[PDB]
Tab-separated table of N, CA and C in Angstrom:
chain	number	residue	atom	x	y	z
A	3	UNK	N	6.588	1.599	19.531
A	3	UNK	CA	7.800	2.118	20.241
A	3	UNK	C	8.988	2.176	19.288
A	4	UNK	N	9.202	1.113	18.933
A	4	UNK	CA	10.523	1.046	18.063
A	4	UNK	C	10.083	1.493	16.771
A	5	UNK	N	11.202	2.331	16.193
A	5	UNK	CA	10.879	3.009	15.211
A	5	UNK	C	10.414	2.431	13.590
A	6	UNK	N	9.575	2.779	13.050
A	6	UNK	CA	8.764	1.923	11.986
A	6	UNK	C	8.268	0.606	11.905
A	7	UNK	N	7.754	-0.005	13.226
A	7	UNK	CA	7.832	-1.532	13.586
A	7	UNK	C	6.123	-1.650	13.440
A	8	UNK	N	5.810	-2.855	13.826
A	8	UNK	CA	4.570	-3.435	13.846
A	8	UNK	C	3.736	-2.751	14.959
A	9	UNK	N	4.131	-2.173	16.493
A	9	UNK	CA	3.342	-1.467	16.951
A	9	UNK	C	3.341	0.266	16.509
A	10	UNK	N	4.592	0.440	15.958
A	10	UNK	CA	4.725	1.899	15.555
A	10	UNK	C	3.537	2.182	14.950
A	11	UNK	N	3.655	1.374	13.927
A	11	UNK	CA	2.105	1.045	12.718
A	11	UNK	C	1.092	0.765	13.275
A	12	UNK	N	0.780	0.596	14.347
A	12	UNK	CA	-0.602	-0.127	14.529
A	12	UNK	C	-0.863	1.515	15.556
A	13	UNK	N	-0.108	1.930	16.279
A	13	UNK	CA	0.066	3.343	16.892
A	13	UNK	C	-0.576	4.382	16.260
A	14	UNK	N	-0.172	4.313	14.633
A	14	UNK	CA	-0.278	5.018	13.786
A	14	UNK	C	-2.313	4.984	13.150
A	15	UNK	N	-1.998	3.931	13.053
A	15	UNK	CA	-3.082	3.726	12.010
A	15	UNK	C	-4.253	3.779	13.052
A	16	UNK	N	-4.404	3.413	14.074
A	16	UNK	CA	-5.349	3.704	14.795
A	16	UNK	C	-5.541	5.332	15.461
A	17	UNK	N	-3.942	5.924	15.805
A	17	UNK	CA	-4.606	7.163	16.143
A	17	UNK	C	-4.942	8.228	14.355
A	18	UNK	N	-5.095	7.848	13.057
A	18	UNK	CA	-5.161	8.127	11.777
A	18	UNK	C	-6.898	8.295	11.737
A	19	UNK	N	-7.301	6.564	12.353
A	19	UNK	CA	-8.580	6.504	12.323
A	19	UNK	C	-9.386	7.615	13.295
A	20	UNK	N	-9.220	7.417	14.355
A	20	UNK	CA	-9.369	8.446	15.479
A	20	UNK	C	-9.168	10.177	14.836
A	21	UNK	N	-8.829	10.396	14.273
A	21	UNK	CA	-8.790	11.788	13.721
A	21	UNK	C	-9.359	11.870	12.355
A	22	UNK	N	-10.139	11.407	11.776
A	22	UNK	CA	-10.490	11.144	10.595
A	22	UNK	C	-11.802	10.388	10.800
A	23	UNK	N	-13.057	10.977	11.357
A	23	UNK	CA	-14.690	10.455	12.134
A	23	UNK	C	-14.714	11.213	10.912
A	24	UNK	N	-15.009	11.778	9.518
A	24	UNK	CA	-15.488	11.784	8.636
A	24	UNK	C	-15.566	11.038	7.426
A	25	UNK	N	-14.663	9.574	7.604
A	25	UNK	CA	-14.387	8.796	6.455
A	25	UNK	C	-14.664	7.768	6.871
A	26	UNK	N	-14.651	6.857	6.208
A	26	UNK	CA	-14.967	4.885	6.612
A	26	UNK	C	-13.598	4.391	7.158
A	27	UNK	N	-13.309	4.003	8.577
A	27	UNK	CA	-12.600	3.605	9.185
A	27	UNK	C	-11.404	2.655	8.146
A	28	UNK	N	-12.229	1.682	7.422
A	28	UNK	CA	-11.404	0.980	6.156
A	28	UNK	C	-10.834	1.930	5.226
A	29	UNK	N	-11.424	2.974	4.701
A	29	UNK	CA	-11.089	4.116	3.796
A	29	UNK	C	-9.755	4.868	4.291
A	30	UNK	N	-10.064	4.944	5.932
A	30	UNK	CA	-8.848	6.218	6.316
A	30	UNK	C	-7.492	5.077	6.086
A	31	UNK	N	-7.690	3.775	6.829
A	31	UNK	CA	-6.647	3.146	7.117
A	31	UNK	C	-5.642	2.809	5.125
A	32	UNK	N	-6.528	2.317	4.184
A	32	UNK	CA	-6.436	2.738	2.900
A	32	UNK	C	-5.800	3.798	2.320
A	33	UNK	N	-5.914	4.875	2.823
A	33	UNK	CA	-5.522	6.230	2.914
A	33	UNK	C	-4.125	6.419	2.959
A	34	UNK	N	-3.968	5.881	4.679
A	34	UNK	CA	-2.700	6.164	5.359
A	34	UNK	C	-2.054	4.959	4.838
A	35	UNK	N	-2.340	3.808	4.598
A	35	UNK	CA	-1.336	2.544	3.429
A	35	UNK	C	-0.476	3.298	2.185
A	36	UNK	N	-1.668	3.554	1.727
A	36	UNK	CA	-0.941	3.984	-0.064
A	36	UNK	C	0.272	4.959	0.418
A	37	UNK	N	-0.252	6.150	1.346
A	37	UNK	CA	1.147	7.264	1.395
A	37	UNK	C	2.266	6.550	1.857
A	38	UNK	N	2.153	5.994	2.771
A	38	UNK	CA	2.945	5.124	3.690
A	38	UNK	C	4.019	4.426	3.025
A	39	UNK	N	2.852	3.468	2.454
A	39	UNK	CA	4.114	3.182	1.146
A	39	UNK	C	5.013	3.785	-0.224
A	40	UNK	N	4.017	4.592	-0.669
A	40	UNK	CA	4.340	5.338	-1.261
A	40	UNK	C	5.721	6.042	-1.162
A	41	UNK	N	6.270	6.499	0.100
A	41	UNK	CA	7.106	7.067	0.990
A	41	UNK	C	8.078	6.164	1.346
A	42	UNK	N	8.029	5.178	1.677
A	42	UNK	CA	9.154	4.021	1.345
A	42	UNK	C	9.493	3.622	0.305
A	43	UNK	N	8.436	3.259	-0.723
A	43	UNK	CA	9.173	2.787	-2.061
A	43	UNK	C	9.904	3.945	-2.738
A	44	UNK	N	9.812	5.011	-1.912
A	44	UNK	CA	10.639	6.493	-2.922
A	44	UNK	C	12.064	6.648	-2.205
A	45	UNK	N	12.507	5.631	-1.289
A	45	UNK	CA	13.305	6.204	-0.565
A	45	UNK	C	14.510	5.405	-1.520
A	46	UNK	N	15.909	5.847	-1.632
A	46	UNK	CA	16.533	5.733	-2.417
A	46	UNK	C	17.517	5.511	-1.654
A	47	UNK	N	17.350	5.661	-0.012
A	47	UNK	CA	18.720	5.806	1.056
A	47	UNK	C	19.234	4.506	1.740
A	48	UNK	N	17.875	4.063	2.104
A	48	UNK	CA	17.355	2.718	2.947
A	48	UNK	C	17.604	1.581	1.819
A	49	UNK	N	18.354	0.504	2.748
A	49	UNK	CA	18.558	-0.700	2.026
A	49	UNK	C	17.064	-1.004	1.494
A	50	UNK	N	16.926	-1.803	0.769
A	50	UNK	CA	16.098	-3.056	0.155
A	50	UNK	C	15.412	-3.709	0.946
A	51	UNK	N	16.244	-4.634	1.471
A	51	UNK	CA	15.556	-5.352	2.910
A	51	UNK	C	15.067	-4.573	3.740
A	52	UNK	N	15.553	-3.289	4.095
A	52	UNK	CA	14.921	-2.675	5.074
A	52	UNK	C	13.817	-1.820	4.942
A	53	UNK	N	13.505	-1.372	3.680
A	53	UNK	CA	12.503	-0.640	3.251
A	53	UNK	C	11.470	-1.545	3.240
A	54	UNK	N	11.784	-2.772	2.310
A	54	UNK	CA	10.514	-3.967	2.356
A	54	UNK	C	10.164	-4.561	3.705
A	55	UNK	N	10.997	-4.728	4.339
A	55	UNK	CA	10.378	-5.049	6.058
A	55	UNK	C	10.096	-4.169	6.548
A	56	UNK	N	10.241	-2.606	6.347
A	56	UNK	CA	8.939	-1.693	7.217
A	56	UNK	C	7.685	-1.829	6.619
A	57	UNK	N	7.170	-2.173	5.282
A	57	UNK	CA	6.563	-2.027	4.412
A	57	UNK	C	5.630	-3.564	5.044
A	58	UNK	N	6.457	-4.451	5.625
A	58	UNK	CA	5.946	-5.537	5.779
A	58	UNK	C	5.116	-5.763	7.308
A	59	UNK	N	6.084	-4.742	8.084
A	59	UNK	CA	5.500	-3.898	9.658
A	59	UNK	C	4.256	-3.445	9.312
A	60	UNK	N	4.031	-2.539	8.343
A	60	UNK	CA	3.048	-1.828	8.044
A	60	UNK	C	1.962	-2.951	7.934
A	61	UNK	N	1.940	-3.787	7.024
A	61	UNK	CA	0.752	-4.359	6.399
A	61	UNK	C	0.483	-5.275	7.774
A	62	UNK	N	1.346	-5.523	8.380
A	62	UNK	CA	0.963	-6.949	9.838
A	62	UNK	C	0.393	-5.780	10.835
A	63	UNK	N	0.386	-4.701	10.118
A	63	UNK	CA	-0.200	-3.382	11.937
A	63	UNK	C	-1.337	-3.493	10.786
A	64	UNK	N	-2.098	-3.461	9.653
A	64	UNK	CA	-2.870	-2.851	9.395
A	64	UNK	C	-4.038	-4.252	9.280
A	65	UNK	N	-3.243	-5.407	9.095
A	65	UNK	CA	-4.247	-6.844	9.201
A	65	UNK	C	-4.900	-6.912	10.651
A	66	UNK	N	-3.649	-6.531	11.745
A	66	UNK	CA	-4.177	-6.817	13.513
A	66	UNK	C	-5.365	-5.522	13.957
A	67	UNK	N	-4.998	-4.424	13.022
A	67	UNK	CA	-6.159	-3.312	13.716
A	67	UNK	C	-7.330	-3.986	13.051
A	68	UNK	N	-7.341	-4.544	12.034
A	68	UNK	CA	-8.212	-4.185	10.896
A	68	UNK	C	-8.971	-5.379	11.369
A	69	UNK	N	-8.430	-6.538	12.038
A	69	UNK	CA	-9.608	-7.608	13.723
A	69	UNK	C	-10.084	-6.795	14.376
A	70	UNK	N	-9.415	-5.779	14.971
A	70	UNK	CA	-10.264	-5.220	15.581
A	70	UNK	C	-11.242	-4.578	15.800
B	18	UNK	N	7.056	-7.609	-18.605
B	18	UNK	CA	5.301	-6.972	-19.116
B	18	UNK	C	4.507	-7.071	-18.040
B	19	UNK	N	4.593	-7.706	-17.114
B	19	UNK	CA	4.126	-8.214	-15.851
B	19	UNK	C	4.478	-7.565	-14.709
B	20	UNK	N	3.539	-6.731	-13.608
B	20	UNK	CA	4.054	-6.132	-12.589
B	20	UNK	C	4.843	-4.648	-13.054
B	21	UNK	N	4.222	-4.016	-14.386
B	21	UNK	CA	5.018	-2.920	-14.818
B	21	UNK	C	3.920	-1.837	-14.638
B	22	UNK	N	4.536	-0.675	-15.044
B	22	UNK	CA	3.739	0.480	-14.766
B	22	UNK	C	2.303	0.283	-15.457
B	23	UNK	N	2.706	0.124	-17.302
B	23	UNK	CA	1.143	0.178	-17.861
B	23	UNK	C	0.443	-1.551	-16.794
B	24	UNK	N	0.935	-2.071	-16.638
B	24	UNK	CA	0.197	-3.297	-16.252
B	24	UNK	C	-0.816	-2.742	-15.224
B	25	UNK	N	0.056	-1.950	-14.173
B	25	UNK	CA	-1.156	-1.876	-12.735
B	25	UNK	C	-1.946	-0.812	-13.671
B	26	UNK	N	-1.636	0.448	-14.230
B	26	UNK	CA	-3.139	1.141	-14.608
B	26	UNK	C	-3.868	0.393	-15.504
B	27	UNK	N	-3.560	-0.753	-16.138
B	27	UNK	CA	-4.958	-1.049	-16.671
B	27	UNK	C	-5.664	-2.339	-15.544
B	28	UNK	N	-5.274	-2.792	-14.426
B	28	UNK	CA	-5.627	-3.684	-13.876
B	28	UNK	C	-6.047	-2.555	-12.584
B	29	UNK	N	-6.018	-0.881	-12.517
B	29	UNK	CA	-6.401	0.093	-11.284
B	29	UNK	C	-7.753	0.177	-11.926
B	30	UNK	N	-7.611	0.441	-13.667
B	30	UNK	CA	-8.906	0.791	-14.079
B	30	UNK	C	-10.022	-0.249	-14.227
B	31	UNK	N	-9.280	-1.381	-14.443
B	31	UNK	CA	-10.693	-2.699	-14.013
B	31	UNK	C	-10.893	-2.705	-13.006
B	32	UNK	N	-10.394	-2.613	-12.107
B	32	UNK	CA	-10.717	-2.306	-10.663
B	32	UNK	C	-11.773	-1.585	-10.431
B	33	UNK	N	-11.493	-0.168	-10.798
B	33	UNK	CA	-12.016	0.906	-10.776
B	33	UNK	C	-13.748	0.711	-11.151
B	34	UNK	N	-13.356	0.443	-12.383
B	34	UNK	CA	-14.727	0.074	-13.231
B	34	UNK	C	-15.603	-1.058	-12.784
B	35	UNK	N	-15.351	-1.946	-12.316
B	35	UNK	CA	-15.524	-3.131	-11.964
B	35	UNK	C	-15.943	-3.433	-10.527
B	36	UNK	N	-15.942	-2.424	-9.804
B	36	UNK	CA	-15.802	-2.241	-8.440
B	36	UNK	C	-17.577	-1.634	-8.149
B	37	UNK	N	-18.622	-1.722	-7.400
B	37	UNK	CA	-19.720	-1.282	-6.987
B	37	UNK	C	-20.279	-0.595	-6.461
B	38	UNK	N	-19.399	-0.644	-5.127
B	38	UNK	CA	-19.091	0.162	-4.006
B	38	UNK	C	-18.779	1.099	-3.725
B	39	UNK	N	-17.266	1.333	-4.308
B	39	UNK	CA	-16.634	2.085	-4.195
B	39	UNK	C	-15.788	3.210	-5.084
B	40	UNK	N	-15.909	4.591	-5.005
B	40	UNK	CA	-16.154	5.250	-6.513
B	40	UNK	C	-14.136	5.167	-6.688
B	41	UNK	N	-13.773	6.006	-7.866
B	41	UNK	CA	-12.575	6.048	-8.134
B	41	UNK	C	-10.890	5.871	-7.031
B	42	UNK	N	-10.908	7.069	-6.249
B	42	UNK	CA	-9.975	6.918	-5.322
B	42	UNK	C	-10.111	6.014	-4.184
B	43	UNK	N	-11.358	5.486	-3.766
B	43	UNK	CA	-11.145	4.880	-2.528
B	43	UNK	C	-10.929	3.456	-3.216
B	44	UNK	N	-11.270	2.822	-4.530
B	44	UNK	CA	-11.091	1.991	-5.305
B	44	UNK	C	-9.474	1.754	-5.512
B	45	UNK	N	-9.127	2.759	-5.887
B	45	UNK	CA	-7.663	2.833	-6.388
B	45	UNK	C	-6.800	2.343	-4.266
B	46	UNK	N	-7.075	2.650	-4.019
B	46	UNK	CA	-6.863	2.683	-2.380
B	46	UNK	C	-6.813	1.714	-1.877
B	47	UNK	N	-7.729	0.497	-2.151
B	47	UNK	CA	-8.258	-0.830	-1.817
B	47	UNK	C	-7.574	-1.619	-3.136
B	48	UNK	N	-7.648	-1.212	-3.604
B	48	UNK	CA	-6.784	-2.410	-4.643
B	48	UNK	C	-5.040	-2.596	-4.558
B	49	UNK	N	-4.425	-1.089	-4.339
B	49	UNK	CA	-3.295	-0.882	-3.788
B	49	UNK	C	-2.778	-1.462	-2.599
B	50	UNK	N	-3.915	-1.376	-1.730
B	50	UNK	CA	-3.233	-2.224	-0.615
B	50	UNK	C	-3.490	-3.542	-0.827
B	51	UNK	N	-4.586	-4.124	-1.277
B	51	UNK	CA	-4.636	-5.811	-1.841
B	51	UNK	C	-3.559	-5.977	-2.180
B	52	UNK	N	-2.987	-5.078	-3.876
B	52	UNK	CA	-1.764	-5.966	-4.186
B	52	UNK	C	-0.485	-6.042	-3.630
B	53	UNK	N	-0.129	-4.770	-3.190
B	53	UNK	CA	1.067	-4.987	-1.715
B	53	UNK	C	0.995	-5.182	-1.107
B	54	UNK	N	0.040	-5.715	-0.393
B	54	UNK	CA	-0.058	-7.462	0.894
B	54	UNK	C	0.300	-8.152	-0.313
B	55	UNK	N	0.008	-8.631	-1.186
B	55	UNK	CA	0.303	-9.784	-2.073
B	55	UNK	C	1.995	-9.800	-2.183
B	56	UNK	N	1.974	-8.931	-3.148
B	56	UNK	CA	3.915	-8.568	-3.275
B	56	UNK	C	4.700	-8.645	-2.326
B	57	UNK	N	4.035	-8.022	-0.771
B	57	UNK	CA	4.794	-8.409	0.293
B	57	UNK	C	5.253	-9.870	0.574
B	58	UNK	N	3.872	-10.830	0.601
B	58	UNK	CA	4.026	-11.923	1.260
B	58	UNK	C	4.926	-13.110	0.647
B	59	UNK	N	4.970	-12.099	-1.331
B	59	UNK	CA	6.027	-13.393	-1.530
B	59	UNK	C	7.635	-13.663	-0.916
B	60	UNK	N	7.478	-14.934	-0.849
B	60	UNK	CA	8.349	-15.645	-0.174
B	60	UNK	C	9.626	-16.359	-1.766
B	61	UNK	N	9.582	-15.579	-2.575
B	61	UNK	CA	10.481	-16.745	-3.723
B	61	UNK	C	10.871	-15.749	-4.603
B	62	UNK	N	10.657	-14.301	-4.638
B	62	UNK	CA	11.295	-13.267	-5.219
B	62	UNK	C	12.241	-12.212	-5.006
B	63	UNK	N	13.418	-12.327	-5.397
B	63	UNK	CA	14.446	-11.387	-4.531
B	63	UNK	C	13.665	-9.824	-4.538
B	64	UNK	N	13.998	-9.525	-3.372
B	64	UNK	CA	13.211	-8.636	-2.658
B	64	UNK	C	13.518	-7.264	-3.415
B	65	UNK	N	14.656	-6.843	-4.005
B	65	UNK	CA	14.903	-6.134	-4.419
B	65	UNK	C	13.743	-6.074	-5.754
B	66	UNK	N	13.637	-7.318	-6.333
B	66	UNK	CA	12.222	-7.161	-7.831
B	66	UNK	C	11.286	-6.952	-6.798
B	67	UNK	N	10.398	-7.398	-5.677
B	67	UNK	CA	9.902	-7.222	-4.948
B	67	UNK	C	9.438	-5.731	-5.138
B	68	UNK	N	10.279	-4.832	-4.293
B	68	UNK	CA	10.672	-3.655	-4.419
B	68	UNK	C	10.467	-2.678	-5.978
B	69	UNK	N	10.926	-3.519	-6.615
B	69	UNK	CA	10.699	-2.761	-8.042
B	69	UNK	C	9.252	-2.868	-8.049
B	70	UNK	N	8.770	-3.673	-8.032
B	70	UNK	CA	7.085	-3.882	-8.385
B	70	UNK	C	6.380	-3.059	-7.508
B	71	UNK	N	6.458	-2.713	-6.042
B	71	UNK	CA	5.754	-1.890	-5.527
B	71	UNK	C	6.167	-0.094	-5.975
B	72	UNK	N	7.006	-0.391	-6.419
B	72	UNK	CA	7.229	1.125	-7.195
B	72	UNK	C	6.117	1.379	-8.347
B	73	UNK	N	6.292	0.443	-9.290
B	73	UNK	CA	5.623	0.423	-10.455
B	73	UNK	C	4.241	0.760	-10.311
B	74	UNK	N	3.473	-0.034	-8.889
B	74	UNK	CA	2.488	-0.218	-8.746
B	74	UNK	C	2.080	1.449	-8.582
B	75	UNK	N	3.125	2.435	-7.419
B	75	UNK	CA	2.947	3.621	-7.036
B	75	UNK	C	2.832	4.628	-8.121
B	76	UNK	N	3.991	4.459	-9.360
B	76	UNK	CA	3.799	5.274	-10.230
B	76	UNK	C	2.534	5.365	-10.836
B	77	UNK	N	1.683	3.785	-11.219
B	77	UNK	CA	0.533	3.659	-11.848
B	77	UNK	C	-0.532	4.495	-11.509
B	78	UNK	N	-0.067	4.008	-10.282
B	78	UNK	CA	-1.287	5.212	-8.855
B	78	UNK	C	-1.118	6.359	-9.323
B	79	UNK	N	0.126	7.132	-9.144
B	79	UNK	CA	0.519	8.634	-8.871
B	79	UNK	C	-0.370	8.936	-10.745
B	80	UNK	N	-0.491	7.966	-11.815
B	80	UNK	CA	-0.325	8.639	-12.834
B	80	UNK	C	-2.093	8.497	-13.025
B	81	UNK	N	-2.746	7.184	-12.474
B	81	UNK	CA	-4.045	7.549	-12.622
B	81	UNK	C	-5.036	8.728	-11.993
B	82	UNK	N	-4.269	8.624	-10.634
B	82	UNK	CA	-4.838	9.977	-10.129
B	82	UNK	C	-4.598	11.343	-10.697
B	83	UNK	N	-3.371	11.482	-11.092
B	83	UNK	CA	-3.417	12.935	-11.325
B	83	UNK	C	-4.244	12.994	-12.872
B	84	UNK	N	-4.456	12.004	-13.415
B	84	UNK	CA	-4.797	11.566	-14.711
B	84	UNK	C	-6.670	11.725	-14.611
């Protein structure tokens, strides 16, 4: 719901997997990490703290899918 | 010298090489996210070096792949 948060990410990465039945579920989610970040660490606008705590949203959505 | 650009491509390409499973990009993919869970979780580095290092790590990426 809230924008770039821990369910945003977990929103994400599961409907990523769901559209992507041609790759290894671990592979797609891999996939959608690297850009993800990739795309934050380029941002030049966003504080510090705030870039590294979406970055940190990201990885806690991709540990809770990745139980599942 | 540590956490710099040449550092992650020669630690993408042991990876790479070193890896069994999994061929070049999905290698590079899985090691990327290993080490930024790592970089994330520290707790004792101002976040801003933090930050620098996951850059470094991206350029390494951006330069082995297109490489």
């Amino acid at each position: 719901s809230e924008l770039f948060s821990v369910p945003y990410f977990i929103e994400n990465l599961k409907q990523h997997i769901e559209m992507n039945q041609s790759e290894d579920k671990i592979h797609a989610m891999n996939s959608y990490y690297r850009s993800v970040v990739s795309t934050l660490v380029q941002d030049q606008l966003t504080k510090n703290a705030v870039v590294l705590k979406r970055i940190q949203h990201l990885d806690e959505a991709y540990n809770k899918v990745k139980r599942g």
